[PDB]
Structure formats: structure tokens, C-alpha cells
Design a protein around this ligand. Structure first.
Ligand SMILES: Cc1cc2nc3c(=O)[nH]c(=O)nc-3n(C[C@H](O)[C@H](O)[C@H](O)COP(=O)(O)OP(=O)(O)OC[C@H]3O[C@@H](n4cnc5c(N)ncnc54)[C@H](O)[C@@H]3O)c2cc1C
Length: 404
């Protein structure tokens, strides 16, 4: 067959469809979308949107007419099974489709809070437009929310809930916030900023039970035995890559759908991109899964480029960002295994960067309200070039000249 079937119409799904057309792909392109919304943006969900008037499709990538003009078949359905041998995609509507090449961009789903009463009505998640909209409408009728999970999303939400007048308590099991993604100097800064806004941070604890009265949430019980009163709970304790269906078809999976340097599964005719993909990284010499718009986007481009001619190893350089309250956090590079951190700028001035090193080499830059340092990293890191810790701290050391 000639048709390219895309399962999942989020960032990666939408981008591969678009990039496929830009590259003048002749075949048919079907985009399976299991949500009652035109493909939309995720980043605004825990940011601006929570502050908007809730405009139905204000987060749409492109308007409805776009998919028609682009010959991208937008199918309002969901894949449930994959017939690799018959190269057919089995939808839930009962329908079935043959494919030349199958692109899996199923992303990842919320990991359910595994605690008593965790499923009461007032225990909400925050990852889909729908979930964002209910939370937006629910906050005005709530006085106190406990946020479980100090990840990016949880804090982006916490600041807004606080800004709206709600009482806010953040529950994190680790000793500091964003422990899975940033170095201590960043956690510290944000701990101060949020605390300063009146948000009460709680470290070293897990939720062990959701205290309720009738079926009304009244608090969150912690592993230290104490209970934090609240009438609303927002949980962000991780996701689960959607690999089930692919695994059901015999495709290797783990913490994501396994793919090689070219984002291909063990079955040619089937690729995996975005949050759902556990790819082989030539640059970093290891298999990993990355959750970011950058990753979804660059991976989509890589596949689109392959299915149209030049098959190259995926090498989208990783970078992320987060908008918490009035502060902007930008990260370029992977900081895992950092053994030396240098501060450039001033924490007091609320504009600085943490230059992270490992074995004497710059591995990443975490910039708070300092776009210039981020541009420096985005240019230098992909080239695998570095700057000494001494130079990073020196405000008289010109980053523009260094990156020319
Ligand atoms: C609230 C929020 C804020 C974020 N903010 C940022 C940010 O500021 N910066 C950043 O870099 N990243 C951010 N991210 C992460 C970013 O959204 C993800 O990295 C990106 O969406 C991953 O793209 P994706 O295409 O793989 O999957 P997603 O966008 O999640 O889309 C997956 C889509 O596939 C659908 N689907 C799943 N299974 C099936 C199936 N079997 N059949 C059909 N359809 C299916 C899903 O319902 C969904 O619509 C944020 C994420 C969230 C949730």
C-alpha cells in the first residue's frame, strides 16, 4: 500500500503529517485522532489557558480547513489493534485500514494515583484539554488545593491556582522540586519564589490516602501520618507511555515503544515518535524517551524526511521550557550525571543560568529569565563545543563571540 497511517494526533502526530506533505509525499495520509478536538497544543494547558475564558479551540494547531487543503485525512477514531502481517490498522469504530507505513504517535497517559479514595470527583489530573477545562471551571468554587507532584506541570498550575486566590500545598516525595529534571540550584530558586507567593511546599512525603467526608474530598493524608486539609486535589505523579497496543502486536516495548536510530520498530512499515518512543540516540549513546515539544517535533521531521528519501539518524538536540508564575525556565541539553554547576548572572536579580558540567564538559544550561544564555547553549551544544566553568561565571566573557 501507499498510505501512511498516523496513530495519535498530538504534537508528533500532527507534525509528521504536516512535514510529510511539505516534503511532497505522494501517498495518502490518515491522522487518527481519538479526542473530541482538532489537533491542539499541550503547553498552554497548564499555563495561559487556565487563565483564559476557555475558548473551545483556541489551542488548535491549525483550523479545520487546513487538513482538507493539505489532503491530510483527519479521522475521529482510535486504534485498538494492529495486524502487522496484514498491514492493517484496526480502529475501535470497527472499521479497519490498510497501510503502507504506520506511524505511532500515541504519546503517554496519566499514571493513576494508587491511593484510597483517589478516584473521588475532586481528584483531578492535568494533561488533556478536557482536564484543563474542568480544572479551569472548578477552581473558582474551591478554596484549597493540594498539588501532588512537584514536576513542571504541577508548579505551573500551583502558581496560577495561588494567583487566583486558592490556598496551595505542594506534596513532593523527593527532597526538592523538579528532582527528575533540574539541578538543585533551580529547585532552590523556584522553592523560594513559590513559597514567597504563599504556596506551602512539603518534601519527603507521599500521599497515602485521600481524606473524604461522604464523597467530598477534605484532605490528603501523607506518609508521615499527618493530613493536609483541602477541597481539591491535582495529581501529577508521572505518566505511562502508551505502548500497550504495540506490545500486543509483538513489537518490543519497555518504558516506551522501542525504535532504532531512525525511529523504526523491529517491523519496517512501523515507526514510533514522540512521548511514546524509546529511541536509540547516536549522540548520547543510549536509548531514551523524551517528553518535550522539541522531541515530538524533531522526531516527526526525521520520520517525514525518511519516508520521502533521506533516511538519517535522529539527532534533534533536546531542549525544554517551563512557565511558572512570572518566571521563565529554559533548559537546553541533558543534565543527568552533573558533577559541577556554575551560576552565571544573579539569583537575587531573578535572572541567571546554571551551567551544568560533567567531567569538565558543558552538558546543559538551565536559564531562568535569561534568554541569551539559552540561545548560547542551543548553538554551542549541538556542535558539541564547550565553555569552561571559569568562563561561564565571567560576565565579561562574551557569549556571542564564543558562539559565532
Ligand atoms: C499540561 C502540559 C504542558 C506541557 N508543557 C510543555 C512545555 O511548556 N514545553 C515542552 O517542551 N513540553 C511540554 N509538554 C510536553 C508535550 O506536550 C509533549 O512532549 C508532547 O505533547 C508529546 O507529543 P506526542 O505527539 O507524542 O503526544 P501528545 O501530544 O500527548 O499526543 C498523543 C495523542 O495521541 C492520542 N492517542 C493515544 N493513543 C491513541 C490510539 N491508540 N489511537 C488514536 N489516538 C491515540 C492521545 O489521545 C493524544 O491526543 C506539556 C505537556 C502537558 C500535558
Amino acid at each position: 500500500n501507499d498510505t501512511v497511517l498516523i496513530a495519535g494526533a498530538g504534537h508528533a502526530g500532527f507534525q509528521v503529517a504536516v512535514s510529510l506533505r511539505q516534503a511532497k509525499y505522494p501517498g495518502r495520509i490518515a491522522l487518527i485522532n481519538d479526542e473530541k478536538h482538532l489537533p491542539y497544543q499541550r503547553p498552554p494547558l497548564s499555563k495561559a489557558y487556565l487563565k483564559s475564558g476557555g475558548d473551545p479551540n483556541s489551542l488548535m494547531f491549525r483550523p479545520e480547513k487546513f487538513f482538507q487543503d493539505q489532503a491530510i485525512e483527519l479521522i475521529s477514531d482510535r486504534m485498538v489493534s494492529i495486524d502487522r502481517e496484514g498491514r492493517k490498522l484496526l480502529l475501535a469504530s470497527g472499521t479497519a485500514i490498510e497501510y503502507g507505513h504506520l506511524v505511532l504517535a500515541t504519546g503517554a497517559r496519566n499514571r493513576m494515583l494508587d491511593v484510597p479514595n483517589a478516584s473521588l470527583p475532586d481528584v483531578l489530573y492535568l494533561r488533556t484539554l478536557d482536564e484543563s477545562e474542568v480544572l479551569r471551571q472548578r477552581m473558582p468554587d474551591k478554596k484549597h488545593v493540594v498539588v501532588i507532584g512537584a514536576g513542571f506541570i504541577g508548579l505551573e498550575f500551583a502558581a496560577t491556582a495561588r494567583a487566583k486566590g486558592l490556598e496551595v500545598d505542594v506534596v513532593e516525595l523527593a527532597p526538592r522540586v523538579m528532582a527528575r529534571v533540574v539541578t538543585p540550584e533551580i529547585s532552590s530558586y523556584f522553592h523560594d519564589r513559590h513559597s514567597g507567593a504563599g504556596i506551602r511546599m512539603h518534601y519527603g512525603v507521599r500521599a497515602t490516602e485521600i481524606a473524604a467526608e461522604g464523597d467530598r474530598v477534605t484532605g490528603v493524608v501523607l506518609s508521615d501520618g499527618n493530613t493536609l486539609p483541602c477541597d481539591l486535589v491535582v495529581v501529577g505523579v508521572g505518566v505511562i507511555p502508551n505502548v500497550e497496543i504495540a506490545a500486543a502486536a509483538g513489537l518490543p516495548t519497555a518504558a516506551g515503544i522501542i525504535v532504532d536510530q531512525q525511529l523504526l520498530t523491529s517491523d519496517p512499515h512501523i515507526s514510533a515518535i514522540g512521548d511514546c518512543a524509546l529511541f536509540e540516540s547516536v549522540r548520547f549513546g543510549e536509548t531514551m524517551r523524551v517528553e518535550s515539544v522539541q522531541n515530538a517535533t524533531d522526531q516527526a521531521r526525521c520520520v517525514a524526511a525518511r519516508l520521502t528519501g533521506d533516511a538519517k539518524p535522529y539527532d534533534g538536540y533536546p531542549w525544554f521550557w517551563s512557565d511558572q508564575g512570572d518566571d521563565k525556565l529554559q533548559i537546553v541539553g541533558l543534565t543527568a550525571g552533573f558533577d559541577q554547576v556554575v551560576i552565571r548572572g544573579s539569583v537575587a536579580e531573578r535572572s541567571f543560568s546554571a551551567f551544568c558540567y560533567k567531567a569538565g564538559k558543558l552538558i546543559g544550561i538551565e536559564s531562568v529569565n535569561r534568554a541569551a544564555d539559552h540561545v548560547f547553549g542551543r548553538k554551542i551544544l549541538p556542535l558539541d563545543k564547550s565553555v569552561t566553568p571559569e568562563q561561564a561565571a565571567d560576565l565579561s566573557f562574551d557569549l556571542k563571540k564564543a558562539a559565532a
